[PDB]
Amino acid sequence: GRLLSVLLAVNVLLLACTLISGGAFNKVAVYDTDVFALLTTMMLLAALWIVFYLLRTARCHAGPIWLRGGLVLFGICTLVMDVFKTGYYSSFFECQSAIKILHPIIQAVFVIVQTYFLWISTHLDLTRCGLMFTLATNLAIWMAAVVDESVHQFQQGYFYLYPFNIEYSLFASTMLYVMWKNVGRLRETFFAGPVLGLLLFVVGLAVFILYEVQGHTRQALVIYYSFNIVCLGLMTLVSLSGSVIYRFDHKNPTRTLDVALLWGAALGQYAISYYSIVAVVVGSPRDLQGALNLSHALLMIAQHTFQNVFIIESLHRGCHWRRRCLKDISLFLLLCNVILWIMPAFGARPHFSNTVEVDFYGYSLWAAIVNICLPFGIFYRMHAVSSLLEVYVLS
Amino acid sequence: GRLLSVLLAVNVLLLACTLISGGAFNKVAVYDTDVFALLTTMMLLAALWIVFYLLRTARCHAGPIWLRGGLVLFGICTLVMDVFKTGYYSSFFECQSAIKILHPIIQAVFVIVQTYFLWISTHLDLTRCGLMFTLATNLAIWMAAVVDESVHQFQQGYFYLYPFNIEYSLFASTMLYVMWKNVGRLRETFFAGPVLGLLLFVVGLAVFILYEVQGHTRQALVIYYSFNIVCLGLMTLVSLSGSVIYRFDHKNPTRTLDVALLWGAALGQYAISYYSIVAVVVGSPRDLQGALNLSHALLMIAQHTFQNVFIIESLHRGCHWRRRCLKDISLFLLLCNVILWIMPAFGARPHFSNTVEVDFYGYSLWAAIVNICLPFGIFYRMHAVSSLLEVYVLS
């Protein structure tokens, strides 16, 4: 029963991916009305099954806790873009299409119905098939959203806000996959860590608002790299310091999900860093921006690796200074993970400091790379904070 | 212990993929010496671990049976290209590089050592890590080979033969993955079916030699499409006829591997057919080639679906005419699967009949699509023949 649902999802996803990639990367003309028509169709049956599932279940392990919160946060963002889309598109109908208008309406309906369904708590065969088709619907929306940014380059304001379709589809797919598996299942502070973390959070918040929400001057590029190098460098030292603390000091099983999620979600920033490193080593003239870009890219790999080691060891384990110091290390890393969570979440994907990478790969290729890998940093930062909350609670 | 090996493989693979994709799709210059240097490096540790594994095991479930045969068949092809590469590259050294020569030598060493290792039959942690790194080495070679064809467009003859690196890396990765999982494991003929299958095999063999080994005339394009439509159309009718035979007529468990492989490997031809259909519906003028291309693409989807249904039902089950007719249906499908196995195996990937798809997507994009999806048709055709051999044996 499980294999039938998996095969249905992949076959549906493959057909959707071919239509999305074929209609955008062809040489005759770029097609979006058919892509919108396909996505509007896929959400319809996905919404219909969920609506049927909700009605048939009203009379009648869970994954990360932060999944529900991130799903609602990005679902609301996906609702705002749809509301702005219909308002602008319904202003004039003689120049546009019906799908240009039915698609945001159906997506808004799909987001509302799916977000409520995933938030709340027998025919297992239909349930698995419906969930897996819903997973394929979200992954098709994720791929179309990624391709949409790649091919790029009052009207309800100016559509300055960008569609958060990549991030919501990631959270929805994870929640649907988790639920699909479960179908038929049988004080103490030195006043030095939190203070430093709060200062870095305040400084980074100013940088994000000043330069990252939206051509920028040289000082702006220096400020952004200076903060990130300091922020990532401090966690690298702090996480390393925490690891050697445990060195001076089994029966519980290995938390496979925690280790897989921490290392798995760190792959997104690894790919961005690896792409950036070769884009600096080659192309990026030897200049201040190249040195800052190379150090920042290298520090992301170091920060992700050494923070993961500290978190994994601390969870598995479960001198008066020993406990007091670990509270600040957990708290400093917790605050430093929150501040750099906003950049992959609410920052312009291509970024302004990525001139070297954009010149090396081109805007179309680099935009696709960041739009694929940066949203996975949202998963890592959210899971690191929750894991550090757990670590800080115990010891 | 299993998760550590998986994370090591993906992290190694991601670094290799970034170097391969970054060095070829950038806008400054296309780099291949570094890509060759990286691949030559990865095979070195992969070969060293295998060599160490073989020596340490001399003193001391299995997957599809056809995997070993296909691995040797394509491993030998990968040896021939390496022998021709060194011979041509060693003719002149003042204009070439050392990696241009060490890379084919190391690949030939890597292929010889790996093929013998996979053919033959405690530190499970090292064994899993070494196998998973070897899997990442082959997948990196597979991706570089696919990118190499995509970016395209006596010298030891004329290098007319193309590197069979895509097909061998697929067989090697499957065998390594299968072995990684198992580490620490606790007559009767109507004289109408075989005759038709033999005739189709003979006709298709002539078509493959005449036009598919290597600009072609209109008659050549008509002949190729005529045979494929007839061949795929006949299996569609024959497989459907076999399915309704069983309709006129449990305790054994579902053969998940057989169902997954049959449906999973059919995805490659589905993607090619789906890409072809939208490349005809749009672009391909309404002409004879468009009609033949559309029918052939649609018949591949029908042939794969209806053949899979007949094979899956027949295996699970395990009137005198009832048994006699199924022998011919199994034998006709067996011979018809062999003849269309050579096209994805020994035929020019872009093909001569793919002018409509090439014009729609461009040579670079279409070559990547066929070089990714067509080799998976080799897995399906080989598994269909073995499954039909099993079906013909029982009933």
Author numbering:
A (entry chain A), B (entry chain B): 28 to 87, 97 to 157, 164 to 195, 237 to 269, 287 to 314, 320 to 354, 361 to 429, 487 to 563
Mind quoting what the paper says about this structure?
The otopetrin (OTOP) proteins were recently characterized as extracellular proton-activated proton channels. Several recent OTOP channel structures demonstrated that the channels form a dimer with each subunit adopting a double-barrel architecture. In this study, we performed structural and functional characterization of the Caenorhabditis elegans OTOP8 (CeOTOP8) and mouse OTOP2 (mOTOP2) and illuminated a set of conformational changes related to the proton-conducting process in OTOP. Combining the structural information from both channels, we propose a working model describing the multi-step conformational changes during the proton conducting process.
To verify the importance of inter-subunit contact for channel activity, we performed mutagenesis at the dimer interface of mOTOP2. In these mutations, one or two interfacial residues on TM1 or TM9 are replaced by tryptophan. No channel activity was observed in three single mutants, including L30W, V370W, and M374W. The lack of channel activity in these mutants are not caused by low expression in HEK cells or the disruption of their dimerization, as all three loss-of-function mutants were expressed at an even higher level than the wild-type channel and all can be purified as a stable dimer. Furthermore, we also determined the cryo-EM structure of one of the loss-of-function mutants, M374W, at pH 8.0 and demonstrated that other than a different side chain at residue 374 the mutant structure is virtually identical to the wild-type mOTOP2. It is interesting to note that those functional mutations are largely clustered at the extracellular half of the interface whereas the three loss-of-function mutations are all positioned near the intracellular end of the interface. The functional effects of these interfacial mutations correlate with the structural observation of progressively increased sliding movement towards the intracellular side of the dimer interface between TM1 and C-barrel. We suspect that the interfacial Trp-scanning mutagenesis changes the propensity of the inter-subunit movement and those mutations near the cytosolic side of the interface inflict stronger hindrance to the interfacial sliding movement and mitigate the channel activity, reminiscent of the inhibitory effect of Trp54 at the N-terminus of TM1 in CeOTOP8 channel.
